[PDB]
Structure formats: structure tokens, C-alpha cells
Symmetry: C2
Subunit: 94 residues, 2 copies
């Protein structure tokens, strides 16, 4: 299940979670994904580093939800896993 296959309403909830609860888990994700520190600096160029990270990660087949969930586990952010499953409920594709 590629992250790029999700509807825009699901991607907006990933932004809302880091905008409203804890905008800092993406640093830990980039660490366990093994991103070089120059990419972490390229993501902090914007106030929403999550939007740039998700768009940049979606360029490659590694962008599976299975890999995202494994990295979330390695950083002890199973709370974000639980929230993203509960917030998966939606109403339209657009």
C-alpha cells in the first residue's frame, strides 16, 4: 500500500496531526529512514517540513505504509499509528 495511493483527505490528516499535536516526530522518522542530514535541513526550509518530507519520500517505491509503520514503531510513536488508523474514516475522494 503506497502512501501516494491514498486520497488527499488522508494526506491532510497527516499534516493536521503534526500541525496540532506534535510537529517533531518527522525528525525521528528521517533518522530511522536513514535520510542524510542535508535532507533534514532541506525539509526545515518550510514551516510544514512534513509536507516536503511526504512529497519527497513519495518519489520512490520505498514509500509503503508497511515501511512507514515499521519506522513509526522504531521511534516509539505507536500513538501516531493508533491516531492515523482512527482518523482513516472519510466522506469523499476530493
Amino acid at each position: 500500500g503506497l502512501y501516494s495511493s491514498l486520497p488527499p483527505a488522508k494526506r491532510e490528516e497527516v499534516e493536521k496531526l503534526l500541525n496540532g499535536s506534535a510537529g517533531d516526530t518527522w525528525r525521528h522518522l528521517a533518522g530511522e529512514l536513514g535520510y542524510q542530514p542535508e535532507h533534514i535541513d532541506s525539509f526545515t526550509h518550510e514551516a510544514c517540513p512534513v509536507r516536503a518530507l511526504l512529497a519527497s519520500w513519495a518519489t520512490q517505491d520505498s514509500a509503503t505504509l508497511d515501511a512507514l509503520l515499521a519506522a513509526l514503531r522504531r521511534i516509539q510513536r505507536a500513538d501516531l499509528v493508533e491516531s492515523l488508523c482512527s482518523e482513516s474514516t472519510a466522506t469523499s475522494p476530493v
Copy 2:
């Protein structure tokens, strides 16, 4: 002078620079200011960590432009010193 003594239009320009050009420089500042690593994570709870940093800095007498400039020099961001001084000639309080 104290950063807390500036008009709100100047504080909006410090936010707009980190929101729109590059939002990394507050991390480098927090390092040379000698902040604890828990404060860095507490600021990144929000999308605009600069708004929370500037608020938690304005509550102490350490918030002088003289200290801000010394930190900006140590982090090799004298380009930002020029940009912020070049916007100081505003005439638009709120």
C-alpha cells in the same frame, strides 16, 4: 534594545523569513543560546517553532538585540542580520 520592545510588524517579519525563505536558523540559534534539548523538542510541537521560541525568549532580560546579533554571528547567518536591519525602517504599527 529588548526584542520584546519591537512593534508586532517586526515580529511578523522574523516569522515570515523563517516561514518563507528557510526555517532552520532558530535551531542553530537555540544551540548557541545554550538552550536544553527538551526546549528544542517543545518548540517543534508546533509548525512555527519560531513563534514559541520568540515568546519564551521575550519573557527574560537576555532577549537583547546585542545577544541576538552575537548568536547570529556564531552561526554564520550575518545575511539574516542584514535582512532584519534593512526591514527595521518600517512605519506601520498595529
